[PDB]
């Protein structure tokens, strides 16, 4: 897999974001994770987390997996990085997302995220408290 550039257009919530990619505005849905909706417990915390991580970064990148690049709603499916640090993994590590929606052929970073979740659960963080 390889990283590609993008720039923030606007934060949305824990697992979606509006980015410009190849010069076009797109809503991205982060691969392999599920954050609570804003309406839910830890929703606002997830959204604040990704809003901060992505607004403070100098360099946003997206990395597509080997499978579908867009979902049925036209959302881009990617791993997002903020100054080299994967937002999808950071959410999981902090107990602000569950590993979820693991489809075959778009699951390159599955084990990486599961290891993060195991550590979040150990530490009883947020969703796991
Ligand atoms: C993360 C992800 C979600 N989806 C679809 C499945 C879910 O369909 P339904 O809308 O039918 O439940 C929806 C979940 O996204 P949200 O968790 O953002 O709602 O997005 C994919 O198709 N591929 C993916 O990789
Ligand atoms: Ca969600």
The encoded tokens of residue 61 equal 């990148």
Q: What is the resolution of this structure in A?
A: 1.8
Residues known to be catalytic: 29, 37, 75
What secondary structure does DSSP assign to 66-129, as a single string?
SS-SB-TTS-EEEEEEETTEEHHHHHHHTTS-EE----TTS-TTHHHHHHHHHHHHHTT-GGG-
Helix, strand, or coil (residue 3):
coil
H/E stretch holding 42 reads: none
Partners of 63 in the β-ladder: 79
Q: Whose CA is nearest to atom 5 of ligand 1?
A: 71
Q: Whose CA is nearest to atom 2 of ligand 1?
A: 101
Cα(88) to ligand 2 centroid in Å equals 12
Cα dihedral value 38, 126, 114, 103, nearest 10 = -20
What secondary structure does DSSP assign to 44-65, as a single string?
HHHHHHHHHHHHS-S-EEEE--
Domains by residue range for the chain, with CATH? 1-129 (2.40.50.90)
Ligand 1 atom nearest residue 72's Cα: 22
Distances (CA, A) of 102 to 14, 30, 40, 59: 17, 11, 22, 27
CA distance 113 to 32: 8
């Amino acid at each position: 897999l390889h990283k590609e550039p993008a720039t923030l257009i606007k934060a949305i919530d824990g697992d979606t974001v509006k980015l410009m990619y190849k010069g076009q505005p797109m809503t991205f849905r982060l691969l392999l994770v599920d954050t609570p909706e804003f309406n839910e417990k830890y929703g606002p915390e997830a959204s604040a987390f990704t809003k901060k991580m992505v607004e403070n970064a100098k360099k946003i990148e997206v990395e597509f997996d080997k499978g579908q690049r867009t979902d049925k709603y036209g959302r881009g499916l990617a791993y997002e990085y903020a100054d080299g640090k994967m937002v999808n993994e950071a959410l999981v590590r902090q107990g602000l997302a569950k590993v979820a929606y693991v489809y075959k052929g778009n699951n390159t970073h599955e084990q990486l995220l599961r290891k993060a979740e195991a550590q979040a659960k150990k530490e009883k963080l947020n969703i796991w408290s």
